Structure 1
Amino acid sequence: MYKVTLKTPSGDKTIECPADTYILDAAEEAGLDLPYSCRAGACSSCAGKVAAGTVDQSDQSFLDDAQMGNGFVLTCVAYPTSDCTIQTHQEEALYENLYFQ
C-alpha cells in the first residue's frame, strides 16, 4: 500500500492504504478520530485534505483537480496514488480554504 500520514485534530498517524481501497479503511485501522459515512461519495463533509503526496479523488462532488493540488481531497471515495500525508477534518478547505495551505 501507500503510506499516508493522516493529520487529525488529535495528531497524525501513518496508515497503509491500497491503490484500490479508500483511505478511511486504513485510516480507521490506524486509530484515527475519523468518522464513518457513505464510502460512496454522497457528500464532502468527510473530505480529507492532501497535505502531502497524492490520492485518487477525481470523481469528487464539488471538489476539482486544482483543489487536489491545493491539497483538498475526499476520504470516502479516494485513496493515495502515492505515499502522502492527509489532513482529516478540514472539509471546509474545499469550500473556502481553511487557510491551512
Structure 2
Amino acid sequence: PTVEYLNYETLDDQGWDMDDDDLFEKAADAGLDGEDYGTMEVAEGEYILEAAEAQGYDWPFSCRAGACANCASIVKEGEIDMDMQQILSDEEVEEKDVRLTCIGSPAADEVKIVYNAKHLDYLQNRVI
C-alpha cells in the first residue's frame, strides 16, 4: 500500500501539470523538497495523514468546528477509504480530486495525491 504525495505548491512554482508532465515522475528527475514530493508508504487501514505525519509530512488540517468532511488534498490517481460519507460529492473527487486524508486510509495500492491543497485559491481568500 503506497501513496505518492506531491506538494500542490510545487505544481505552480515548477509550472508543471498534474498528469501532463507526470510531475510524480519528473519530480524524481530533479529533487524537490522531500517533504513536498515523494512516494508515501503506509499499511492498508492506517490513516494516511497519520502514516505520513510520522515521516514529517504536514497537512493543512481543514477541520472546522463541528464535524468535518473537507480536508485539502488532490488525489492524482487511486482511491482512498474513510468513515461514512454523504456531504462530499463524486464530482468533487473527479473535478477536484479532493478527499479525506486525516483519518482516511488508502483503498488501493499505489495512489497519487497532492498535499497542502490549502494553497488552492478557492481558500487562500478565506485564510484570514
TM-score, length-normalised on structure 2? 0.54
In the aligned structure 2, how far is the partner of 1:92 from the partner of 1:62? 23
Q: Is the 8 A contact 1:50 1:73 kept in 2?
A: yes
Distance 1:30 1:61, change over 3 A: farther
State percent identity of aligned pairs.
33
**Long gaps (5+) in structure 1:** 97-101
CA 1:32 to 1:67, structure 2 compared with 1: closer, same or farther past 3 Å?
same
Match 2:106 to one of 80, 84, 93: 80
**1:25 aligns with one of 50, 70, 79:** 50
Aligned letter for 1:3? T
Q: Distance in 2 between matches of 1:84 and 1:37?
A: 21
What count of residue pairs does the alignment treat as equivalent? 94
Matches of 2:86 and 2:49, distance apart in 1: 17
For the residue of structure 2 that corresponds to 1:24, the secondary structure is helix
Measure, in 2, the Cα distance between the counterparts of 1:31 and 1:73. Answer: 20
CA distance in 2, matches of 1:5, 1:59: 24
Cα distance change on mapping 1:25 and 1:45 into 2, 3 Å? same
Cα distance in structure 2, aligned partners of 1:69 and 1:58: 19
Q: Runs in 1 of length 4+ with deviation above 6 angstroms?
A: none
8 A Cα contact 2:4 2:40, kept in partner? yes
After TM superposition, give the deviation of residue 55 of structure 1 in Å. 0.8
Cα 1:29–1:61, aligned 2, differ >3 Å: closer, same or farther?
farther
The correspondence for 2:116, drawn from 89, 92, 98, is: 89
Higher helix share: 2
Counterpart residue type for residue 31 of structure 1: G
Structure 2 residue runs of 5 or longer lacking an equivalent are: 10-32, 123-128
Q: Corresponding residue for 2:16?
A: none
Q: Higher Cα Rg: structure 1 or 2?
A: 2
1:74 is displaced (CA, Å) by 1.1
